[PDB]
Amino acid sequence: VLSEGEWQLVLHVWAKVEADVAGHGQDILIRLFKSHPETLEKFDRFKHLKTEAEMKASEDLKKHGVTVLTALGAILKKKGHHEAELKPLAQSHATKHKIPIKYLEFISEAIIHVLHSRHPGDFGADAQGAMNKALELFRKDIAAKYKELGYQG
């Protein structure tokens, strides 16, 4: 359970992300795919991209970063009362996209790296800890729905 103060750290930084959703989404996905190449393989849409420059040139990849970050921002602004928003997400990522929970950990690491790079004066260690808590809470709740569907593994 995050405290009110921890939520405010989270949503303060997040409001900065909302100024440039597509740049951030691009940097996050590129960092995920470079750090953890197995992740790229989950996207038939992007598995043709072999170099970081081709990633950065891809309009389709920047479109998908905005999709991912808009859905994440909608969940964070619920401050933990996010069951309606996580259900469909977990359903599709377990049963259609086949994404292990561990790769949710990976993309959380990429999100924390990118936010430290882009917003260091709003993302000191208090805010980093908080955002880590927030992302852990998303992963706990998606993992519980995986388990329900037979995919926690």
Q: Which residues bind ligand HEM (CB under 6 A)?
A: 39, 42-43, 45, 67-68, 71-72, 89, 92-93, 97, 99, 103-104, 107
93 is in an annotated binding site: yes
User: How many other CB atoms are there within 10 angstroms of residue 56's CB atom?
Assistant: 13
Q: What is the nearest approach in angstroms of ligand HEM to the Cβ of residue 126?
A: 22
- Work out the angle at residue 23's Cα, subtended by the Cα atoms of residues 14 and 12, and round it to the nearest 5 degrees: 10
Q: Which is nearer to ligand HEM, 4 or 62 (CB)?
A: 62
Count, residues in the chain: 153
Measuring CA to CA, which residue among 60, 52, 53, 54 is closest to residue 22?
60
Q: Which is nearer to ligand HEM, 4 or 90 (CB)?
A: 90
- Closest residue (Cβ) to ligand HEM? 92
Tell me the CA distances in angstroms from 120 to 16, 30, 73, one per residue in order: 11, 20, 19
Q: Are 28 and 69 in contact (CB under 8 A)?
A: yes
81 is in an annotated binding site: no
Q: What is the nearest approach in angstroms of ligand HEM to the Cβ of residue 66?
A: 10
Q: What is the nearest approach in angstroms of ligand HEM to the Cβ of residue 121?
A: 24
Give the residue ranges of the annotated binding site for O2.
64
Residues contributing to the annotated binding site for heme b: 93
